[PDB]
Design a protein around this ligand. Structure first.
Ligand SMILES: O=C(NCc1cccc(CNc2ccc3[nH]ncc3c2)c1)c1cc(-c2ccc(F)cc2)cc(O)c1O
Ligand SMILES: [Cl-]
Ligand SMILES: [Cl-]
Ligand SMILES: [Mg+2]
Length: 213
C-alpha cells in the first residue's frame, strides 16, 4: 500500500466528487498534515493558475503527472473544449492520476498517457492529432527538461508564443534547462520565485515563451 494510493483514498473520502477545488484542498491537507509528496502544491499552484488564466490555452501538454494534482489544477481552469495531455512513466501513478481526474469530473478534458515523454512526444502529431501546443508544463525528471524541450522543437510542436512553464527550477533544480532557455534568443523567460510544495524552502517556476527559430 503506497503513499500515492493513500492520497487518492484521502481525496475520495474527504473531497466532493466533481468538485476540483475540493480535490486540490484535500491533497494539500493530506500532504501538509500526513505525508509530504511531490505535488506542485498551493504556493506554486497559485502562480500556475495565474498563468493559465492569462493564456487560456486550448491544448496543454504536461510532462510528469504523478498523482494528477497539477492536471486537476490546470484542467479545472481550461475553457470549454480545451484539452490537456499528460504523460506519466510510472504505471501505478498513471492509474492514480486517471482515478483522480475521474473523481474530479475532469476526465473528458484530460488524456493521461502512460509512457516516457521521449517515446510519446514524437507520436503526438500522427497519433494524438496535435498540430502545435499552446502550453507545456514540465514536471518530470529534471534532467529531461532540456532534452524534451529540444525534442518538442524538433518535432514541430512549438509555435510562436508557446508557453513553457517549468517546476522546480531551484529545488531540485534544472540547471542545464535554465541556462539554456535564459541564454537563447528563441525564448523569452520570466522567473516566479515561490516555495517548494509544503515546505519553507525557496523554489520557483520558470516561464519560457517560445519565439520561433
Ligand atoms: O523529481 C521530481 N519530479 C520528477 C519525478 C521524480 C520521481 C519520479 C518521477 C516519475 N515520473 C516521470 C518521470 C519521467 C518521465 N518521462 N515522461 C514522463 C515521466 C514521468 C518523476 C520532484 C522532486 C521534488 C523534490 C524531491 C525531494 C526534495 F527533497 C525536494 C524536492 C519536488 C518536485 O516538485 C518534483 O517534481
Ligand atoms: Cl503535481
Ligand atoms: Cl504549498
Ligand atoms: Mg515538481
Amino acid at each position: 500500500d503506497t503513499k500515492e494510493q493513500r492520497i487518492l483514498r484521502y481525496v475520495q473520502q474527504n473531497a466532493k466528487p466533481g468538485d476540483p477545488q475540493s480535490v486540490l484542498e484535500a491533497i494539500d491537507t493530506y500532504c501538509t498534515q500526513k505525508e509530504w509528496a511531490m505535488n506542485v502544491g498551493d504556493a506554486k499552484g497559485q502562480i500556475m493558475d495565474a498563468v493559465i488564466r492569462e493564456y487560456s490555452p486550448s491544448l496543454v501538454l504536461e510532462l510528469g503527472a504523478y498523482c494528477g494534482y497539477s492536471a486537476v489544477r490546470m484542467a479545472r481552469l481550461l475553457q470549454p473544449g480545451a484539452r490537456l495531455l499528460t504523460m506519466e512513466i510510472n504505471p501505478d501513478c498513471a492509474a492514480i492520476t486517471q482515478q483522480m481526474l475521474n473523481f474530479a469530473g475532469l476526465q473528458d478534458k484530460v488524456t493521461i498517457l502512460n509512457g516516457a515523454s521521449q517515446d510519446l512526444i514524437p507520436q503526438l502529431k500522427k497519433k494524438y492529432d496535435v498540430d502545435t501546443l499552446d502550453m507545456v508544463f514540465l514536471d518530470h525528471w529534471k534532467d529531461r527538461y532540456l532534452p524534451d524541450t529540444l525534442l518538442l522543437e524538433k518535432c514541430g510542436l512549438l509555435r510562436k508564443g508557446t508557453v513553457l512553464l517549468a517546476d522546480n527550477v531551484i529545488v531540485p533544480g534544472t540547471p542545464d534547462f535554465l541556462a539554456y532557455v535564459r541564454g537563447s534568443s528563441s525564448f523569452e523567460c520570466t522567473h516566479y520565485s515561490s516555495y517548494l510544495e509544503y515546505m519553507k524552502v525557496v523554489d520557483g517556476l520558470e516561464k519560457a515563451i517560445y519565439q520561433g527559430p
